[PDB]
Amino acid sequence: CVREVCRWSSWYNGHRPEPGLGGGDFETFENLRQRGYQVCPVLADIECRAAQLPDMPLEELGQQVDCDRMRGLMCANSQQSPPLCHDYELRVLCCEYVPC
Amino acid sequence: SCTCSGGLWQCQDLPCPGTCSVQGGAHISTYDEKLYDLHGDCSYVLSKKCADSSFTVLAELRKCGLTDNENCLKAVTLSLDGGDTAIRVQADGGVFLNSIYTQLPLSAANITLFTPSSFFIVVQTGLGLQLLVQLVPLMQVFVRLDPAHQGQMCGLCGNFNQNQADDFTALSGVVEATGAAFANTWKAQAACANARNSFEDPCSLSVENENYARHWCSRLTDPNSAFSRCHSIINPKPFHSNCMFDTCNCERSEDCLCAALSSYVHACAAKGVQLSDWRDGVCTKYMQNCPKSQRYAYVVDACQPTCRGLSEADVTCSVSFVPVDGCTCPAGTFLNDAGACVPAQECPCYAHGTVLAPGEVVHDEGAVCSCTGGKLSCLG
Amino acid sequence: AHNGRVCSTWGDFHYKTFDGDVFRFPGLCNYVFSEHCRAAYEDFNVQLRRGLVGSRPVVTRVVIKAQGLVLEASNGSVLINGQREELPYSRTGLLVEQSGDYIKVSIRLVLTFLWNGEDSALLELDPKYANQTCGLCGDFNGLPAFNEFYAHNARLTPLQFGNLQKLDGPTEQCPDPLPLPAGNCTDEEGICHRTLLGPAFAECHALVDSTAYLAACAQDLCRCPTCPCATFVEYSRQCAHAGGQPRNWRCPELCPRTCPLNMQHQECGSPCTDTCSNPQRAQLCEDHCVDGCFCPPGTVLDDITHSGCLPLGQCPCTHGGRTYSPGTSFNTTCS
Numbered sequence A: 001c002v003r004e005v006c007r008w009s010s011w012y013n014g015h016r017p018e019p020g021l022g023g024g025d026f027e028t029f030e031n032l033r034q035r036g037y038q039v040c041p042v043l044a045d046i047e048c049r050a051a052q053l054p055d056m057p058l059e060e061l062g063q064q065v066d067c068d069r070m071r072g073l074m075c076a077n078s079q080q081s082p083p084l085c086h087d088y089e090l091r092v093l094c095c096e097y098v099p100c
Numbered sequence B: 001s002c003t004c005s006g007g008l009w010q011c012q013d014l015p016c017p018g019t020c021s022v023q024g025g026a027h028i029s030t031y032d033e034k035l036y037d038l039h040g041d042c043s044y045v046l047s048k049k050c051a052d053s054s055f056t057v058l059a060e061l062r063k064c065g066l067t068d069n070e071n072c073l074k075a076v077t078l079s080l081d082g083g084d085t086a087i088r089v090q091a092d093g094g095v096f097l098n099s100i101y102t103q104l105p106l107s108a109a110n111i112t113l114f115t116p117s118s119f120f121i122v123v124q125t126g127l128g129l130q131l132l133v134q135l136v137p138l139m140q141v142f143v144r145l146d147p148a149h150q151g152q153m154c155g156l157c158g159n160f161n162q163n164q165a166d167d168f169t170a171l172s173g174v175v176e177a178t179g180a181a182f183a184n185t186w187k188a189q190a191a192c193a194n195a196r197n198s199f200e201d202p203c204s205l206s207v208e209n210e211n212y213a214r215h216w217c218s219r220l221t222d223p224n225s226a227f228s229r230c231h232s233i234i235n236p237k238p239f240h241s242n243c244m245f246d247t248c249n250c251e252r253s254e255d256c257l258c259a260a261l262s263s264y265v266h267a268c269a270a271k272g273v274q275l276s277d278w279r280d281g282v283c284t285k286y287m288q289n290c291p292k293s294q295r296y297a298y299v300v301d302a303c304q305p306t307c308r309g310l311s312e313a314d315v316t317c318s319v320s321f322v323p324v325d326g327c328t329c330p331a332g333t334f335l336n337d338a339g340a341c342v343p344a345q346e347c348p349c350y351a352h353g354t355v356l357a358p359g360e361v362v363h364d365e366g367a368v369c370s371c372t373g374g375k376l377s378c379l380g
Numbered sequence C: 001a002h003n004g005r006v007c008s009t010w011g012d013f014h015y016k017t018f019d020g021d022v023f024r025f026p027g028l029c030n031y032v033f034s035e036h037c038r039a040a041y042e043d044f045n046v047q048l049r050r051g052l053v054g055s056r057p058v059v060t061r062v063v064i065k066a067q068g069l070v071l072e073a074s075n076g077s078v079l080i081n082g083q084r085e086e087l088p089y090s091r092t093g094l095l096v097e098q099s100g101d102y103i104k105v106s107i108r109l110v111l112t113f114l115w116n117g118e119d120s121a122l123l124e125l126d127p128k129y130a131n132q133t134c135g136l137c138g139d140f141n142g143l144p145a146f147n148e149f150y151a152h153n154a155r156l157t158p159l160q161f162g163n164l165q166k167l168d169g170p171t172e173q174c175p176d177p178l179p180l181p182a183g184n185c186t187d188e189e190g191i192c193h194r195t196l197l198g199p200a201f202a203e204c205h206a207l208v209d210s211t212a213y214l215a216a217c218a219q220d221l222c223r224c225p226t227c228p229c230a231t232f233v234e235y236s237r238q239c240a241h242a243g244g245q246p247r248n249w250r251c252p253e254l255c256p257r258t259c260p261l262n263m264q265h266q267e268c269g270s271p272c273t274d275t276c277s278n279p280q281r282a283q284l285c286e287d288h289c290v291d292g293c294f295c296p297p298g299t300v301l302d303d304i305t306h307s308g309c310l311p312l313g314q315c316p317c318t319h320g321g322r323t324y325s326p327g328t329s330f331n332t333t334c335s
C-alpha cells in the first residue's frame, strides 16, 4: 500500500523590505532554493502573512501583495501609499507518499 | 421623451439624476459630462453642495507606481451633517462608520449600506446622493444625484448645471484652464503636492504593452463586438482612450483593462442598455475568483436574496440603483446568516430574531406556526 | 573621441554608465537600458532582458525602439518591425550587420549598438542627448558620482537603481533579485593585476581607471574559471573608446582567439579593413581601434570571392555581376 502523508512547513522570512521606491519584499522559491531554504518541488497550498503583525490577515492589510503557490510572495514599495511594504513571510505545504 | 409630430421631434425631458464618476483612479466624468484626467496624490473634495455642508463626498487618490501619473483610488469618505458622520469605504472593501469597522448591510439615520454583489458597495442616503463604489477589479466610484440639486453643487464633479464650460468654476469666480489646475484648488490638505499635467502617453514605452493594450482595448470600438449596442448612444472614444492609458500605464494591465471595460459597460447600463457576455476570452479570472457557493451574474438589478429578508422583509431592497454586474447567489437560492448559499428549504424562518428551522411546526402564544420553504406562517 | 558617450553591459551583470560608474545589478527581467526621457518627443528606447545560460549571465533579448522602428534582437535572430531579416539589413539612416564578432545596429545621428550575442552589449550615443536620457546607462550629463543614484534627494544603491529602471511584460511579474552575500576568492594569483596593470594597457591607465575593473575581475574569478576574461575585453573596449590604443594582451591561454587561415586576431586594428574592392578605404578613416580579425599590412582583404586576404595584385575584379580572375580581360564593342 501507499498513502499520502502531508504536513505544513515553518515560517520563512529571508529578507527585510527596504525603504524607498524600488524596495520591498521579494520572497521567491528560486531565492529560497539559492539561500539554502528547503523548497519542495511539489506542493498543495501555501500561506503568506506579515511577520510583524501575526494576527490581522493579508486582506485586512489592504496592501498590494501577490502571493501564489507557484511563485511565492512579492510586495513592491512603489505600488502602495505610503510607498512602502511591511515585513512579510510565508510557509509551504509538503506531501510525500509513504508505504502503508 | 420625443414624439414624432409637427414634422419634427417634440422633445420633453424626464428628470434625470446626475452621475459623477471616477474611473481608473485618474479619470473623472463630472455631472456636466466634462471628462478630464487627474493625476493627483491627496484627498480631493469629489462633490459638495457648496451652499451648506449637508454632504461632502471625498476621494483619496494615491500614487501607485514609479511614475507620477500612476494613480489608484484608495478611499471614498462621505462626510455628512457637517462632518458629524463619516462613512469611509476603503479599497479592500472595508467600510468604516465614524472610523469604526462596520460590516454590511447597515441601515441607520436613513443611510443604507449594502453590497448588491461582491464587486460593488451601495451607500444610499436620504440627503439626495447615492454612492456606488466598485472594488473589483480595482477601485472606482460612481455618484448619483436627485436632479433637485441641479446648479447647486461644487467640488471636482462640477456644479451640475448643464453647462460644460462652467465645470472649472473655482471658488474665486473664474473658470480654471485644465484638469490638474482645477483640481489643485480642491485639495483637502494644504500639505499635498499639486497635481501636474501629463502629456507623455505611457503607451509609447513598451511595444509588448502597446500590442497587448491595443489588441484588447480595441474590443470597445469594434462594430461587431458586444459593445456596439451602446455605440449608437454613447461615443466610446473617451472610454477607448481610458482603456489605452490605463493598460499601458497599469502595472496590472489586465486589472486596469477590465476596469475600463467594466466602466464602459456600467456607463452604458446607466444610460439603459444591458450589455452582456462581453468577457469572451478576456477578464475571465474575475468569473472564476468568486466566493464559494456564489456565481457571476451580468444583470444584478436588485438587492441580494437573503433568508432573513424573505422571512421578515428588508429595508435594503427599497433602493433603486443602476444594474451592476458581479458575484451573487443564483436565483432560487439564498444566503443564510452564515453566508453560505442554500436553497429556501435549507434556510430557516426567523421570528423575533429566533432561528426557527425549516419545515418545523411550533407553538407560540396560543398559535401554531410552520416554516415552509423558509416562509413563516402562523394560525390560530 | 567617444569619451563619455558610451555605456555597456558585460559579464556578471556589470553595468558601466556613460559617466564612468560601474556597478553590479543581478536582475533577471527587462529594464530600460536607455531612453530619451527628458524631451518632448522620444528618439530612442533601448531595453535589455538578462537571463541565464545554465549559470552564465547572458542577454536574452534586446528591444531598440527608435523613430518608429522596432528592432528586437534575440535567439540569434533580428526582428525589424516584426519581420525577421537577413543580416545585413540597411535602410536610410539605419544599418544592422553581423559585423565582426557581434551584431551591430547603427542608427545614424542616433546611436550605435554592439551586441556580442551572449553577454556584452555596448551603446554609443550622440552628444546631443546629453542630460536628456535616463536608464541603467545613466544621465549622460557628465557628472559620475553625484546624480545617478539620488532619487528625491535620497542616495540609493545599485540594487535600488537597477530596480527603479524596471519594466514588466504585459502579463509578467518579475521579482527583484536579492543581494548576494559577501565575496571571496579575490585576485589570488594576481592574474587581474598581472594583465590589467600589465604593459598591454599602459596608456589605458592614463584614460580609464581599472579599480572597478579589478574588482569585477575578482568577482568573476569567484564565478567560473572559464569566464574571467569578460572584464579584460571590456577594459580593452573602453580603452579603445576613450581614444587610447590597446595592445594585444591575449596569449594562447588567456581566452585565446581563432581567425581564418590568412586572417589574424588583433586588438586595436583599423576598423576600416582595406579590401581590394576599395583597397584604399583605410586612407582617411575616422574611427577608433576595434578588436577583431584582420589582415597583415600590405595585403588587403578579398571580399569579391572570400579567398582570405590577398596581395593587391592577385585579387579579382568585378563587372556587371561577373567576377574576373586576374589575367582575364573583357572587350566591349567600344573598349
Ligand SMILES: *[C@@H]1O[C@H](CO)[C@@H](O)[C@H](O)[C@H]1NC(C)=O
Residues within 6 Å of the ligand: B108, B109, B110, B126
Ligand atoms: C432620517 O432623518 C431624519 C432627519 O434628520 C431623522 O429625524 C430620522 O431619525 C432619520 N431616520 C429615519 C428612519 O427617519
Ligand SMILES: *[C@@H]1O[C@H](CO)[C@@H](O)[C@H](O)[C@H]1NC(C)=O
Residues within 6 Å of the ligand: C075, C076
Ligand atoms: C534559437 O533559435 C533556434 C532556431 O532558429 C532554436 O533551435 C534555438 O533553440 C533557439 N535558442 C537558442 C538558445 O539557440
Ligand SMILES: *[C@@H]1O[C@H](CO)[C@@H](O)[C@H](O)[C@H]1NC(C)=O
Residues within 6 Å of the ligand: C130, C131, C141
Ligand atoms: C542637466 O540636467 C539638470 C537636471 O535638472 C539641470 O539642472 C542642469 O541645468 C542640466 N545641465 C546641462 C548642462 O544640461
Ligand SMILES: *[C@@H]1O[C@H](CO)[C@@H](O)[C@H](O)[C@H]1NC(C)=O
Residues within 6 Å of the ligand: C329, C330, C331
Ligand atoms: C575579346 O576577349 C576575348 C576573351 O579574352 C578574346 O578571346 C578575344 O580575342 C578578344 N577580342 C579581341 C582581342 O579582339
Ligand SMILES: [Ca+2]
Residues within 6 Å of the ligand: A012, A013, A014, A015, A016, A017, A025, A027, A087, A088, A089
Ligand atoms: Ca521577508
Ligand SMILES: [Ca+2]
Residues within 6 Å of the ligand: B032, B158, B159, B160, B161, B162, B163, B164, B165, B166, B167
Ligand atoms: Ca456645470
Ligand SMILES: [Ca+2]
Residues within 6 Å of the ligand: C019, C138, C139, C140, C141, C142, C143, C144, C145, C146, C147, C148
Ligand atoms: Ca550623472
